[PDB]
């Protein structure tokens, strides 16, 4: 029995979250009650199997088992359509089916959060059905979060509420955690989606390359054959989350840790802390432990490299192998550099050899391989310097208005949502990279910004309009970034013919936060902008000038919320002016 094997490892507790997380992380539409009842009927299974090792049909796998519970509320198409289809299928096809269905953008309603004298009294009169419910709501909006680690989120949530309820002021206690919370759960499910984006699209190789370089920078004085180790086990892990194999995710994830830690003087100085407390918070510790001081006398790479004259030799022999070893050694030496450029370097390096070695004199080819890597460093720093500066005058909000122009003239198929949506993030990475010294500035945006550029690639997927967008997010993983920065503007773009709804503001408008406000505002920025791409940076203003002035007017005014019909038909007639 596997649920039997699991269920022993994880428990009670921990195996009911995971169940919930997965069910709802697969049939995001579906009710919380309904997976409420599914788990347990599931969780009760699963108890007879660690008793009858061979009961009823505790022999089979996960995927079977799992697969038809879902199927017993997924073949009401009426609710979920596309999905029965799934049903109808078997074993392998079934679950990819149902991986393959998974929305990145459910439409589920917004999540507001009731006032706080009714989540504490909720939280303390049942506190079970309470975090549940937390782990369902987010699970289903980020059907690729990182499992283990979201329930180390839900612990900390209840130590929110656990301290907070009990405050002299809950609200100046706990809104604050939950903002905190709110934002790192964003951050960690971004993080999460590029991880299993790589695996998905680009192959593990792939993630190999990325988790070598990661790690090589971490534990510098590690020994090659100690990372290697470790980068297994970690893909391992990823590869079974990113599938839906939550459990075994969460318990590989474990045993990882308990590894890392036994073997501790081989790999970190710096994880003597992390050791020492709770498995969910020692894992977290470990994935969020800062790099180990670097190795006092350390060879030039150049040696073993550039300079020997068996290095074609040695890279035929075990080509993966070789490089993977390159990557170890440049890494491990420069943790001013972010990993997607690691990367890029280690990809010009084996281009290099590669067109180097089949030629009649080797060592003179590869001979200034260098001379190469030069620039590559080079242009992501002088674009960070570039962007930080102007970051540093427009402020935020500008800053991310700058970006909105921008991209909407780069690709101004793609939908105006997504558009505000990614504009706003990549805005968001000058606050947070900007602020450091160059030495850690670089690796903050670049490895960020694959954050964020993910997103969009993976939002655009869905439904494509741009084939621009799908170039730059299917040609390169690690050059994504850059194949954006090339992007200009689209030439052949012709412009959108006005449409008097979309420029009709509401009073509706005036209840909203000051942020929905400056969103309203950037969504017809770039409204705009798609209306009149050739436009310029000047004029933009002027009209943005005005639709300030619209809004404040009318809002204020006591004409009945009618100042939006009629002057909202007035701002429109000044603009086609300019
Ligand atoms: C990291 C951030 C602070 C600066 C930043 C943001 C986005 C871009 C892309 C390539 C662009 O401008 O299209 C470059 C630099
Ligand atoms: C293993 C490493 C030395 C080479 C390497 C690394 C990343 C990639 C991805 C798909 C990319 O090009 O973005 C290809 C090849």
């Known amino acids: 029995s596997e649920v039997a094997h699991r269920f022993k490892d994880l428990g009670e507790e921990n195996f009911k979250a995971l169940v919930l997380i997965a069910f709802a992380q697969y049939l995001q539409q579906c009710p919380f009650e309904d ?212 459990l075994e995710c969460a318990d590989d994830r474990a045993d990882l840790a308990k590894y890392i830690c036994e073997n501790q003087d081989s790999i970190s100085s710096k994880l003597k802390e992390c050791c020492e407390k709770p498995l969910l918070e020692k894992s977290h510790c470990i994935a969020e432990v800062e790099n180990d001081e670097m190795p006092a006398d350390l060879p030039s790479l150049a040696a073993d490299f550039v300079e020997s004259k068996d290095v074609c030799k040695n890279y035929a022999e075990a080509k993966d192998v070789f490089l993977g070893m390159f990557l170890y050694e440049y890494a491990r030496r420069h943790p001013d550099y972010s990993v997607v450029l ?76 997504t558009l505000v949506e990614v504009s706003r993030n990549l805005g968001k990475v000058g606050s947070k990279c900007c602020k450091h010294p160059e030495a850690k500035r670089m690796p903050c945006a670049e490895d960020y910004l694959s954050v964020v550029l993910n997103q969009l690639c993976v939002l655009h997927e869905k439904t494509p309009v741009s084939d621009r967008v799908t170039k730059c997010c299917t040609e390169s993983l690690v050059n994504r970034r850059p194949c954006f920065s090339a992007l200009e503007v689209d030439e052949t773009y012709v412009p959108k013919e006005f449409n008097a709804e979309t420029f009709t503001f509401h009073a509706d408008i005036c209840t909203l936060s000051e942020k929905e406000r400056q969103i309203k505002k950037q969504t017809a920025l770039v409204e705009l902008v798609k209306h009149k791409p050739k436009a310029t940076k000047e004029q933009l203003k002027a009209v943005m000038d005005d639709f300030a002035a619209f809004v404040e007017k009318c809002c204020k005014a006591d004409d009945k919320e009618t100042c939006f019909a009629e002057e909202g038909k007035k701002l429109v007639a000044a603009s086609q002016a300019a």
Request: aromatic share 10%; with cysteine; proline share 5%.
């Open 35 to 246: 997976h409420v009842k599914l788990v347990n009927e599931v969780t009760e299974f699963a108890k007879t199997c660690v008793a009858d090792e061979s009961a009823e049909n505790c022999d089979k796998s996960l995927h079977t088992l799992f697969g038809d519970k879902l199927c017993t509320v997924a073949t009401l198409r009426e609710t979920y359509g596309e999905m029965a289809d799934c049903c109808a299928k078997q074993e392998p096809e079934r679950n990819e089916c149902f991986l393959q269905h998974k929305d990145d953008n459910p439409n589920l309603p917004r999540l507001v959060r009731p006032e706080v004298d009714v989540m504490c009294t909720a939280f303390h009169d049942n506190e079970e059905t309470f975090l549940k419910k937390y782990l369902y709501e987010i699970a289903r909006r980020h059907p690729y979060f990182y499992a283990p680690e979201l329930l180390f989120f839900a612990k900390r949530y209840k130590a929110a509420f656990t301290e907070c309820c009990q405050a002299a002021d809950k609200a100046a206690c706990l809104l604050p955690k939950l903002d905190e919370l709110r934002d790192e759960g964003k951050a960690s499910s971004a993080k999460q989606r590029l991880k299993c984006a790589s695996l998905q699209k680009f192959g593990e190789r792939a993630f190999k390359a990325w988790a070598v370089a990661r790690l090589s920078q971490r534990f510098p004085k590690a020994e090659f054959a100690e990372v290697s180790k470790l980068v297994t086990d970690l893909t391992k892990v990823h590869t079974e989350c990113c599938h839906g194999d939550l």
């Open 342 to 417: 690691l990367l890029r370097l280690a990809k010009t390096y084996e281009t290099t050899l590669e067109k180097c070695c089949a030629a009649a004199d080797p060592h003179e080819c590869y001979a200034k391989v260098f001379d190469e890597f030069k620039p590559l460093v080079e242009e992501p720093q002088n674009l960070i310097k570039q962007n930080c500066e102007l970051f540093e005058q427009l402020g935020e909000y500008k800053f991310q208005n700058a970006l909105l122009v921008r991209y909407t003239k780069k690709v101004p198929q793609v939908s105006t949502p």
